[PDB]
Structures are given as C-alpha cells and as structure tokens.
C-alpha cells in the first residue's frame, strides 16, 4: 500500500563482534595491575532481555583469547623494573642439606657492588632449579635464557577482574543454570561488565573459581574427540589445604649498585615435606558427582576409570599452582585412582625457576616463614584416552579463563533500522 | 509503560521496541590506557557514523524519522501488521540485510532532491 521507508535510531539489534574490552577493579600492588583498571561501579546493572534467545559458544569466545594475552602482557610488564639474575648464572658448588636430598646447599663466587670485588656467598636451591656439569651445579635456565627475579613488593594474589564492553557494544550473560558450553541460551541478560574473574593460574584442578548451580556440569567441544579437554565444573566445593611447612629465611645478596638478589638463607627448625590435603569423603562424593554426568555421554553400563597423568612436562603432570608466593607441583596420583578423619595427601615439590606459557623465565623470591593456603577446587580438566578411562590434563592455560567466561559473549550494537510504514514527510 | 531498560525489548515486537528508543540512544556514547583510549576513540567513531548518515538523510535530531522513499516490495513483501506486531528488530535485520545498502542511497538523494527543491522555493 502507501508504504514508505522510515529511519529508526536506537533499535535493539546486535551482531557477533570482537572488540578490545577493558578491565575494572574495586579497591600494595599486584602483578595484575588492578589498581590501574578503572574503579568498578558499585551498581552493576543487569538488564533482563525477555523473550530473547542467543547462540553462545565458549570455545569460539574471544574474551578468553584476549584475557589470556592480557595476563601474559601483565606478566611481562610487571618484570621490567625488577632485578635481572644474569650474574647468578655462575658455577655453583653444591652439597645436600643434612638429614631426602631435595633442596641443595650451594656456594658460589658472586659480583659485589664494586665491580672488582668478589664475594663467596651461599644459598639454597631446590634441585628442580639446578643441574650438574659432570659437586658442581648450574642453574637450570642458564643454557636457555636469563631469568628476572620477581620484585618482592608485587603480589601474586588473584584479584577479581571485571571485563567491560566499550560504548556502542554490549556483553550478554547466559542465565541458563544447566548450560553446556555451546548452543542457544534461552535466558539472556545484558551486562556492562562481567562478574569478578580471579585470574587464578592453575593446572588440572581449577581453584577458587565459580561453582555451578543446580548440578555439576561438564563441557568440552567434540566430546567424542578424545583430544579435546573436558572442562568439568563442580556444584559444591571440595576443600583443599596446602602448606610448605619448612620455616625458611630470606637473605639479600648485594650483587650490584641497587641490584640485590634475595637468596634462600637456611631452614629454621624441622625439615618437612610440602603437601596438600583433601577430604577423602568430600572428594569421593564429588568424584561421584562427576562420574554421574560422565555416563550421560558415554553410557549407563560402561566403566569409568580414573588414572594419573600420561607424562610430559612437570607443569602438566602435577597440580601446579601458587600458594603464598611459591609455586607448588603436587602429585595428584592419589586423587585420580578410582574405577567406577579421611584426608588424602598429595606430595608437592617446589620450584623457583618457572618459565610459564613459553622464552623468558622468572625467579620467584623465597617467602619467609611457614606457608599454608586454603582453597576451593571448583573445576577440573580431564582427558579421555580412547572401558573408558579419564586422566587429568592442562595443555593450555586459557581453558582456565574459559571456565569463567563461558557465560559471556561480546556483541556490537547497530542501532540503525529501516522499516516500512504509511508515513511521508511534507513539501 | 514498563522501564525494560537497555535492550529491554530485544525479543519484543518491532512496534513495542519502537516506543523505547531513547533508552538505547543514551547508552550509545601506561600501556593499557592505549587499549582503553583505543576503545574510547572507536566509540565516538561508530557513533558519529550513525549521526553522519542521519545527517545526510534529513533525520538529524530524530529518533523516529519519516521519508519520501516508498517501500519496494522487492525488499520485503510482508504486510504492515505481520511486521510491527510479529517480527522482532533482530529478525527484521536479517530479512533486510541485503537491501540495507540500497535504501541508504535512496535516502541520501531523496534528501539532496529535497533541499534542492527547497532552495528553489526560497528563491522568490
């Protein structure tokens, strides 16, 4: 009929898009530099998009692909001012510690604040940081790359980070409490920012993360493809308690004008073994919850076996994380040893020379005192073999951020719309 | 009315969403500051594009703006009632995605062949 086009501005239509999100925080300084993120708004507006159904895919999601680089870029940024431990790449004269031969007692000639004076100083290095020559040892990194000692003022504490969309964009949440990673979310709401994401660098066991409502979900992409890690997300937390019981001492070594390498003094008191604890009861009922949803994809009759890692790097074979500033590497063989008062104990080692992701490495300075931290293990990263067995994995670090950003998806607003009606302008 | 909020009527009929336009019109406008200053500039760029288009259409200042370009049935042979009281704006954007550039040019010269007609009107 008498139908002309009429231009509409501000119509609710969006498109899948990728843009540079920005971070926001709430309240010394941490590696995540959350002081530099704009102050989070105490009023987080969540608008419910009634009748709306959107298609999510946590595996094509780019927020995790951006955060995974924001973390690596924050890591490299937080080590630019810190002291570079290149003079420590010297021949070490190492003996054991009196006592099973784990951490060593090494003495070495070292540069002083005056370039023509040397000092014979000693320090302790866990054997995972040194290797022999033919006793004479050398730091592990000296044939690959120099190492930068972390500044003893920056904190490794994960801070809740909120990702926000710029003006003209939006973030869509998925309020489906039984939402596996992909598909069409029926209950969608728009947010200016995500919730508080703690960038917890972990392995095999997702720590301190966000739980699931209703029931414990499992994700993965092609679940029939065994080379795709299965992200399982608990509904109830299982308690884990880790500790480094040795009472350590920190010793500053003046290796240059202003350059002070913080060495490992000696062990005050008993020598003991760092480890972690989990309630065998709570881990039994939680492993029972995981095998429940594992049958929905593999069968009500097939047996579900749990085993330890298949081998490879130290960081993937063991539950590696950070506890009070020192990096643990816990043998999880006592956790995945099942075929379908308590206390299961995981023997953990400790490293000081970590590379992470790639390259260039960092020497974490020794923390003084007795270390112990209490965490919730809230997720999991499994791997089927392919009479179905499951093992722990953690090949990529971005599966951690993916376990928190599955709810979200970036969309861009295109507010211009043309539609017909019986409206014409005058002359 | 019910303050549905930003994108509140995203799943509603196009006639219902058209009543709530100023809500989506409001909310439309160191190394990490370089990434933040980047998003700040792109925000004004993507906003001024919609305004530049609205400006060369005669719709500069309008949320709802009527024109002289008549509706070609090739774009959508749907009736008026089965559009404003049935489809959502997200649905309408998929059906007109192709012909969305054709209309943007028809609006551009229907405005130049309007201010040209008004220039001859005020010439006497």
């Amino acid at each position, epitope marked *: 009929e008498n139908l002309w086009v009429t231009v509409y501005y501000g119509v609710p239509v969006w498109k899948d898009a990728e843009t540079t999100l920005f971070c926001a925080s709430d309240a010394k300084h941490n590696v995540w530099a959350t002081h530099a993120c704009v102050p989070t708004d105490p009023n987080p507006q969540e608008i419910h998009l009634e*009748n709306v*159904t*959107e*298609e999510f895919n946590m595996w094509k999601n780019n927020m995790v692909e951006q955060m995974h680089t924001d973390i690596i870029s924050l890591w490299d940024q937080s080590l630019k001012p810190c002291v570079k431990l290149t003079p420590l790449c010297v021949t070490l004269q190492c003996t054991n510690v009196t006592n099973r031969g784990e951490l060593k007692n090494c003495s070495f000639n070292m540069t002083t604040e005056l370039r023509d004076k040397k000092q014979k100083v000693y320090s302790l290095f866990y054997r995972l940081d040194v290797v022999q020559i033919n006793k004479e040892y050398r730091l592990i990194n000296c044939n690959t790359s120099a190492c930068t000692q972390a500044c003893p003022k920056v904190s490794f504490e994960p801070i809740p980070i909120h990702y926000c969309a710029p003006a003209g964009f939006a973030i869509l949440k998925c309020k489906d409490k039984k939402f596996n990673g992909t598909g*069409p979310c*029926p209950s969608v709401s728009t947010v200016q920012c995500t919730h508080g994401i703690k960038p917890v660098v972990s392995t095999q066991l997702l720590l301190n993360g966000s739980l699931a409502e209703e029931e414990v979900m499992i994700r993965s992409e092609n679940i029939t493809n065994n080379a795709k890690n299965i992200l399982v997300q608990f509904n109830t937390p299982v308690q884990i308690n880790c500790t480094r019981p040795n009472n350590m001492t920190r010793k500053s070594i003046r290796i240059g004008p202003g350059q002070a390498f913080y060495a490992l003094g000696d062990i005050i008191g008993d020598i003991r073994q760092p480890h972690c604890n989990v309630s065998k009861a709570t881990w039994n009922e939680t492993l029972g919850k995981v095998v429940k949803q594992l049958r929905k994809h593999f069968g009500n009759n097939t047996i579900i076996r749990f085993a330890n890692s298949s081998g490879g790097d130290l960081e993937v074979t063991t539950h590696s994380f950070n506890c009070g500033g020192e990096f643990f590497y816990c043998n999880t063989s006592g956790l995945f040893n099942s075929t379908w008062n308590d206390s299961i104990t995981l023997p953990c080692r400790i490293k000081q020379i970590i590379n992470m992701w790639q390259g260039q490495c960092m020497y974490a300075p020794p923390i003084q005192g007795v270390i112990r931290c209490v965490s919730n293990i809230t997720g999991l990263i499994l791997t089927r073999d392919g009479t179905e067995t499951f093992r722990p994995g953690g090949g990529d670090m971005r599966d951690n951020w993916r376990s928190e950003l599955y709810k979200y998806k970036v969309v861009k607003i295109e507010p211009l719309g043309v539609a017909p009606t019986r409206c014409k302008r005058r002359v | 009315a019910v303050f549905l909020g930003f994108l509140g009527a995203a799943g509603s*009929t196009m*006639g*219902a969403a058209s009543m709530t336009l100023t809500v989506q019109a409001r909310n439309l406008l160191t190394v990490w500051g370089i990434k933040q200053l980047q998003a700040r500039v792109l925000a004004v760029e993507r906003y001024l594009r919609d305004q530049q288009l609205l400006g060369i259409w005669g719709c500069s200042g309008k949320l709802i703006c009527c024109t002289n370009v008549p509706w070609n049935s090739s774009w959508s042979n749907r009736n008026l*009632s*089965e559009i*404003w*009281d*049935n489809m959502t704006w*997200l*649905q309408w954007d998929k059906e007109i995605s192709n012909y969305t550039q054709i209309i943007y040019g028809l609006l551009e010269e229907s405005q130049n062949q309007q201010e040209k007609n008004e220039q001859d009107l005020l010439a006497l």
Partner: nanobody
Amino acid sequence: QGQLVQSGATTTKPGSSVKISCKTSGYRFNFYHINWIRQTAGRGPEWMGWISPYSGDKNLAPAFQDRVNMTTDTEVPVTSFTSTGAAYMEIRNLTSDDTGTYFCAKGLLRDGSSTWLPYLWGQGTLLT
C-alpha cells in the same frame, strides 16, 4: 511457518478420557497462542479455547470449561528464533456426541487485536 503435527486417531468409549498431542516446530513456540478447534458430526466447527505457552494463560468457551484439560510444555530452543514445543488436550465426560476431528492452531500475531486468531493449524485426529 512451521509444522504442528498431532497424535494418531485413537477411539475410546464414553465415560473415558482421551489425550491429544500437538508438537510444534519451525517457530518460537512461546510467541503464539495454541487454539483447539473441532468439527463434529452433529454440528459444525466449534472453538474450544486457547492457551498461551508464554503467559501460561488459559481462555476457553463456557461450553468446554468443565471438560477440557489443556496444558503445554516448555520450548526446547533450536536457534535464536526456532524452538520445539508441545500442547496437550484432554476431555472429561466423554460421549458419542464429541466424536469428531480435532486440531491445534497456533495464533496469528504477537500483538494487536487478532493476536490469538487460529492461523496455523495441525493435521486432524479422529476421536471415538
């Protein structure tokens, strides 16, 4: 713009009750009402009532208010604008007068003055 397949042709005897299904596809099942219409051997067509899969709201003629059990499920979303729903139909005091063909009918629009109008019909089911 989608199908509304129904159940088979079940024939019981008076005093009993019969359940009829209505499985939808090709459209957002929550966005339109579900009308129930029948054409019996004794009268003509007779509108029974509609139910809103979104509001859960029921409106039915007084001639069938104390006989009809009318329910709907919840749509299993296929895409952004596709889903799969189901509406169910039962009756109470059954006789041979209620023998006829029954179909479900999806509404016409989502707003206006002809929102519920039986537009998209099923296939038909032969009762007792």
